[PDB]
């Protein structure tokens, strides 16, 4: 249920997935976060699942930031049909994550509660992950 | 169906001579829309904004202000 309000173009090219992440490689908002170690597309039902799982374990405790937003539409053909009579209708929205990138951050909670929340969130996501803290030094 | 199979025939814009090469007295140096390059010494500007030489000599692309460019043609032979 994250999706933009308007786009300029409903059909877009699909993102490149090679490389390391351009920005957002640091926890800047909370105390802890969840970092990605491989590359995937993340589809905003995965975001909604991983946010719901993480919230109810915290029992409305601390706060949670989502550092990932799905801007890009993706299309698919609805039934399996002949090849190519134009592009299909838009199906969902993706963000693209590459290794380095923080996916979620939490604050206002103890460390082991945060570890358990981020582990429960990470079992919903299609990417490998790593619990991290604020950098210092 | 779709509604998207139109295009236009590409016009062959861009540079037609090089910096440093000798041109004769009326030849087309640059084809563009607008003035990406301005005309300098001995270079005239056509009505479709074609930049052409007015004498024969060596073409020099140089800068114009902080951020503009111009072509001049010097007569040296």
């Amino acid at each position: 249920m994250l999706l933009p309000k308007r786009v300029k173009y409903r059909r877009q090219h699909r993102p490149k997935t090679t490389g390391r992440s351009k920005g957002g490689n640091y926890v800047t908002f909370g105390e802890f976060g969840l970092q990605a170690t491989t590359t995937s597309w993340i589809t905003s039902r995965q975001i909604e699942s991983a946010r719901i799982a993480m919230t109810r374990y915290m029992k409305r405790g601390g706060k949670v930031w989502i550092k990932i937003f799905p801007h890009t539409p993706y299309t698919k053909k609805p039934l399996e049909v002949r090849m190519g009579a134009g592009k299909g209708a838009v199906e969902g929205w993706i963000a693209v994550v590459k290794p380095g990138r923080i996916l979620f951050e939490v604050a206002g909670v103890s460390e082991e509660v945060a570890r358990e929340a981020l582990r429960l969130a990470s079992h919903k996501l299609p990417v490998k992950t790593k619990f991290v803290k604020r950098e210092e030094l | 169906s779709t509604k998207n199979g139109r295009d236009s025939e590409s016009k062959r814009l861009g540079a037609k001579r090089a910096d440093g090469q000798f041109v004769t007295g009326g030849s087309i140096l640059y084809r563009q829309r607008g003035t990406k390059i301005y005309p300098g010494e001995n270079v005239g500007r056509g009505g479709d904004d074609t930049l052409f030489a007015k004498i024969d000599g060596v073409v020099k692309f140089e800068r114009k202000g902080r951020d503009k460019k111009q072509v001049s043609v010097y007569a040296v032979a």
Binding site: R20, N25, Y26, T37, P99, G100, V132, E135, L137 | -
Partner: protein
Amino acid sequence: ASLKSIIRQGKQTRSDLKQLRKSGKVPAVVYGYGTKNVSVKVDEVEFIKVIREVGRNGVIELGVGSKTIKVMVADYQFDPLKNQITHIDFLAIN
């Protein structure tokens, strides 16, 4: 407040930079007033130990060659995916 440094000689290639990072070294520059720019290398664990006791914004008397310089950390490049410091800048404050 007593790091030791070794002057890197000219033109480290890409291979020996990562070969040097495979050891416990980190490349570094020293610039500021009092000196020219000197390309040095620094042991990593020692630098972490100095930083842990002197603070992030501290003063370090590090030795280049013969002389010692009072110096503060200007910036540093960090590799967040494997948590190692990968380059460090030294600003001579005198």
